[PDB]
Amino acid sequence: KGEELFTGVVPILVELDGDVNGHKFSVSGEGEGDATYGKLTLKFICTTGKLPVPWPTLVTTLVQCFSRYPDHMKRHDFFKSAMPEGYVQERTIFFKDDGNYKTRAEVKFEGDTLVNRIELKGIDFKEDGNILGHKLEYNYNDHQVYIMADKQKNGIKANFKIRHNIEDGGVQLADHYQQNTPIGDGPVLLPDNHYLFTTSTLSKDPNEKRDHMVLLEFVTADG
């Protein structure tokens, strides 16, 4: 069972290759996750220079298998059971009155490391808008995610809004549409619909000279 792979502390690697309006960049993340409590600690670096979008806009893209699933719902855990073979995660994210991200990721085990490997393509952004103009506050407003059985494939889907506070006032909406499918061909758990609740905290490493994001997350699933 894939759930057995999460009983202790699991190292995490995140690799993102991005291209937003032709501005190409890479992000790496490293840390660990504890699905017993639902805690994630990760540090991300823009390894190509200055990040061409704001860090908060990448949080959802940069591993819901680490959610704390309570006892009575363990057999509704699609994300962990897909392991070690893993799952594909696809999203489209529409930024209101601005461009959009299209992301494809594979989440799987490589050795004992849970790896999230992402391709991101952004198009139709305004160069002086809130994203390419870096006009968003360095913080986060988390939102619940209603995970529904992709009753029609075998997998899951969800859609939800994320709100990014704008420095000069107001809020930038990021409308998320998500589909996940197992990579393997073994049997999938196909959960009953349920919520994921997340609390994310962004900070900085005072000793890090590169463009970076320190991220601490707590995540649980609810009936």
Side-chain angles (χ1 to χ4, degrees), residues 1-125 127-165 167-223:
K1 204 159 37 93
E3 305 176 330
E4 272 287 285
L5 299 176
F6 293 91
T7 58
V9 170
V10 176
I12 301 167
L13 176 69
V14 184
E15 294 294 353
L16 180 142
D17 185 45
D19 183 345
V20 178
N21 275 36
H23 304 283
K24 301 158 171 302
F25 62 102
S26 184
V27 172
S28 288
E30 325 188 1
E32 31 180 65
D34 176 353
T36 295
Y37 195 57
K39 174 174 162 176
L40 290 159
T41 70
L42 294 159
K43 176 178 173 183
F44 299 91
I45 298 185
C46 181
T47 58
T48 51
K50 202 139 147 52
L51 196 66
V53 297
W55 279 111
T57 70
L58 299 182
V59 168
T60 50
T61 300
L62 300 163
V63 285
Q64 299 161 306
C65 48
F66 283 105
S67 314
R68 201 258 315 160
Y69 271 76
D71 187 3
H72 60 289
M73 339 189 64
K74 267 169 205 260
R75 209 48 82 241
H76 305 265
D77 195 341
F78 162 91
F79 301 111
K80 290 189 193 53
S81 81
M83 281 329 146
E85 301 74 17
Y87 57 83
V88 170
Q89 181 157 302
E90 272 162 334
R91 291 213 185 96
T92 304
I93 306 169
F94 290 96
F95 292 89
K96 207 214 175 130
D97 301 315
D98 215 330
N100 62 92
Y101 297 162
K102 208 217 253 285
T103 71
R104 186 185 184 281
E106 294 189 8
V107 184
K108 65 188 105 169
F109 272 83
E110 300 185 357
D112 285 355
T113 302
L114 191 283
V115 182
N116 180 23
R117 190 176 291 284
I118 310 130
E119 306 171 298
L120 184 149
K121 170 134 200 95
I123 61 174
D124 292 332
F125 285 88
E127 283 274 354
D128 45 22
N130 299 326
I131 289 81
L132 284 182
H134 288 92
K135 300 179 186 183
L136 302 184
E137 292 175 359
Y138 189 71
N139 52 22
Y140 209 76
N141 302 297
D142 286 281
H143 198 281
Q144 54 188 23
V145 176
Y146 196 45
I147 304 281
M148 317 180 282
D150 213 341
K151 127 269 269 152
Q152 37 245 58
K153 302 193 172 215
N154 154 69
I156 59 100
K157 61 196 198 205
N159 65 288
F160 59 92
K161 303 157 160 357
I162 296 289
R163 268 154 209 120
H164 297 297
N165 294 127
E167 268 163 353
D168 286 0
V171 167
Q172 169 73 60
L173 181 67
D175 201 351
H176 282 63
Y177 302 85
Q178 174 179 341
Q179 276 203 105
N180 293 47
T181 52
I183 285 170
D185 291 310
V188 196
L189 297 249
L190 253 269
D192 274 47
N193 307 350
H194 65 283
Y195 276 109
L196 298 179
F197 307 132
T198 306
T199 297
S200 312
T201 307
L202 315 197
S203 57
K204 301 285 189 183
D205 176 356
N207 294 321
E208 179 59 65
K209 288 294 316 203
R210 305 185 262 180
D211 203 355
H212 72 282
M213 167 163 70
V214 179
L215 172 64
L216 167 71
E217 259 167 38
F218 302 91
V219 51
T220 188
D222 189 351

